[PDB]
Structure formats: C-alpha cells, structure tokens
C-alpha cells in the first residue's frame, strides 16, 4: 500500500502479461539499427 504508484503500475502491467513483448522489442531495435548501418555500408560498396 505505501508503495509508489509506478510499482503498482508495473505489477498490473505484468498481470496483463506484457513484459516479454516489451523486452524483446527494445532488444531488437538496437540490432536492427546496427543492420541499418550495415545496409549503408552495403550501398557504399555497391557504388564502388
């Protein structure tokens, strides 16, 4: 009860079952951005 609201928001959000989706999406964003850089490199080499 004397917990700050954010803790209960996290608790109910977990109760909804929406944690794994969140974690995997944020993890995937970094890797995809790195692929974006790679694609830039690819286009450079193609022009050469």
């Amino acid at each position: 009860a004397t917990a700050p609201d954010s803790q209960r928001l996290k608790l109910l959000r977990e109760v909804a079952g929406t944690r794994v989706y969140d974690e995997r999406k944020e993890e995937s964003i970094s890797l995809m951005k790195e692929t974006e850089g790679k694609r830039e490199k690819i286009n450079e080499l193609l022009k050469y």
Binding site: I42, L45, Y48
Partner: peptide
C-alpha cells in the same frame, strides 16, 4: 550479414588484373 560478407568478398575478387608488361 551474409550479403555484406558476400559483397566485401566480391569487391576483393574484382581488384585482380594481369598486365604482362
């Protein structure tokens, strides 16, 4: 990644030449 690797390999390939002088 595989495509990038293949492109880099290709670019290393094409740089050969044979000028017998």
């Amino acid at each position: 990644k595989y495509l990038l690797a293949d492109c880099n390999e290709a670019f290393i390939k094409i740089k050969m030449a044979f000028r017998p002088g």
